[PDB]
């Protein structure tokens, strides 16, 4: 583990990021104690309060837990929804021990076409949200997502929606659960503009994910197309044989 | 549809494949009648028996059905298992209206390794089948598959097994149904060897698929790694929110 004191990136943030890597490395195993706050302080020659800030942040994110008078430990993850269910990008990143975020690239409220109407099974003519975001994990681009949503199913949208979970909004606005999705996966090569935004070379491996998601209603509320970085993302799921 | 009579590819084969294309894009709709032998015969300027040969082979593959007379209808394929369950390559290709095939690249009976023991949950030391095939759809390379299978769960394997469905053999051999799989998918670029065998350019998009498959009783019988042509293959599946 390596701290660079002269870097613009705050010491505490350097520590969080590396500890997060050590957890996915398996250098820090679940339910196993972490070095003490003073040990870390001594091992890097830093303030104990900076260590506290890092550790405390990871506890508050649910990545670590603390037992009063007995230290800090790695938390067991929550995997039912990730492997056996359907996750939003936000839940997906958390299942992987990553911190999700989003930055808006483009927002348009567009007129329905027969093609989009067919896919969403919405009204034509009508209004459809078109939301283009960079999805981040640990402040680093992970995907570019273009998302179409019937206006009636989401109402008026703004920056506060774009920077959090759209799935959470949908369920609260409609007071109906999300129930299922059709998804298609295709491999591809990053275009110049996808590559530049994503932080990878032109032509680098990329996963194209097309998803239509449904309310318990049977009503489609979203059709989305995403490009995920190949170096950082693999898709994982269980399948059951029907009989 | 066009027909090249001077081609080494048999006419009835050229017909089969262009009818398959018509279906795959909905120029022929499910459960809608096709033209008769005479109409096709006249269309291409060929024997009626050649058209019949193309249609009858398609009936046998379940791509078409009959009801009465030689007259033929587009089949409406079962998609439930493909989209919501778990299919072998064989069933997967059929759900797409493609004809699956297999050719052996390599076979070895290998000794158990620590990593492989932990994956399949099998014994160590033990013997493991290592089977590398080119998986074909309509006589054209689709995937390269490398699968590890504990000897005891398959017994002795030969060409008759490799050129057919492993999944079916393992169910017949064991009298226990296949239950579930864990799959991981990652995009990549074809190596030189992979690209050559697949019929694509070096560095062309491929999909890496890693699958561990279990029997109804919980035993893992297969750990497979595959490379799929990005130009022919899309992965499709429904997911339910818990």
UniProtKB/Swiss-Prot annotation, chain B:
Pfam hit, one: UTRA
Keyword Metal-binding: no
Keyword Nucleus among record annotations: no
Annotated residues for binding of N-acetyl-D-glucosamine 6-phosphate: 89-90, 133-135, 145, 165-167, 222, 228
Activity control summary: Binding to DNA is allosterically inhibited by an effector molecule. Binding of the effector to the C-terminal domain leads to a conformational change that modulates binding to DNA and thereby regulates transcription of the target genes. Glucosamine-6-phosphate (GlcN6P) and/or N-acetylglucosamine-6-phosphate (GlcNAc6P) are putative effectors of NagR. Binding of GlcNAc6P may prevent the protein-protein interactions responsible for polymerization along the DNA, but not the specific DNA binding.
Annotated effect of mutating residue 222 to D: No or little effects on GlcNAc6P binding
Induction: Expression is increased by growth on N-acetylglucosamine.
Membrane-spanning residues: none
SUPFAM superfamilies: Chorismate lyase-like, Winged helix' DNA-binding domain
Domain HTH gntR-type span(s) in chain numbering: 9-77
Domain of life: Bacteria
Function (record text): Main transcriptional repressor of genes involved in N-acetylglucosamine (GlcNAc) transport and utilization. Represses the expression of the nagAB and nagP operons by binding directly within their upstream regions. Binds to the DNA consensus sequence 5'-ATTGGTATAGACAACT-3'. Also acts as a weak repressor of mapB expression.
Assembly information from the UniProt record: Homodimer. Forms dimers via the C-terminal effector-binding domain. At high concentrations, probably forms polymers along the DNA.
Protein name in the entry: HTH-type transcriptional repressor NagR
Source organism per UniProt: Bacillus subtilis (strain 168)
Higher taxonomy: Bacteria, Bacillati, Bacillota, Bacilli, Bacillales
């Amino acid at each position: 583990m390596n701290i660079n004191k002269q870097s613009p990136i705050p010491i505490y943030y350097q520590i969080m990021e590396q500890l997060k890597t050590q957890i996915k490395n398996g250098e820090l195993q679940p339910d196993m104690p972490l070095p003490s706050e003073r040990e870390y302080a001594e091992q890097f020659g830093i303030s104990r309060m900076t260590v506290r800030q890092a550790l405390s942040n990871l506890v508050n994110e649910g990545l670590l837990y603390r037992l009063k008078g007995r230290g800090t430990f790695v938390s067991k993850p929550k995997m039912e929804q990730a492997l056996q269910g359907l996750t939003s990008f936000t839940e997906d990143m958390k299942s992987r021990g990553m911190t999700p975020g989003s930055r808006l690239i483009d927002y348009q409220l567009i007129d329905s076409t027969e093609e989009l109407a067919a896919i969403l099974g919405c009204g034509h003519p009508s209004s459809i949200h078109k939301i283009t975001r960079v999805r981040l994990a640990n402040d680093i681009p992970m995907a570019i997502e273009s998302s179409h949503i019937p206006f009636e199913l989401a109402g008026e949208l703004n920056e506060s929606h774009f920077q959090s979970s759209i799935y959470d909004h949908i369920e609260r606005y409609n007071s109906i659960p999300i129930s299922r999705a059709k998804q298609e996966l295709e491999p591809s090569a990053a275009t110049t503009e996808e590559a530049n935004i994503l932080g990878i070379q032109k032509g680098a491996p990329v996963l194209l994910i097309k998803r239509t998601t449904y309310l318990q209603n049977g009503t489609a509320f979203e059709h989305a197309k995403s490009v995920y970085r190949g170096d950082r993302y693999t898709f994982v799921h269980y399948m059951d044989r029907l009989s």
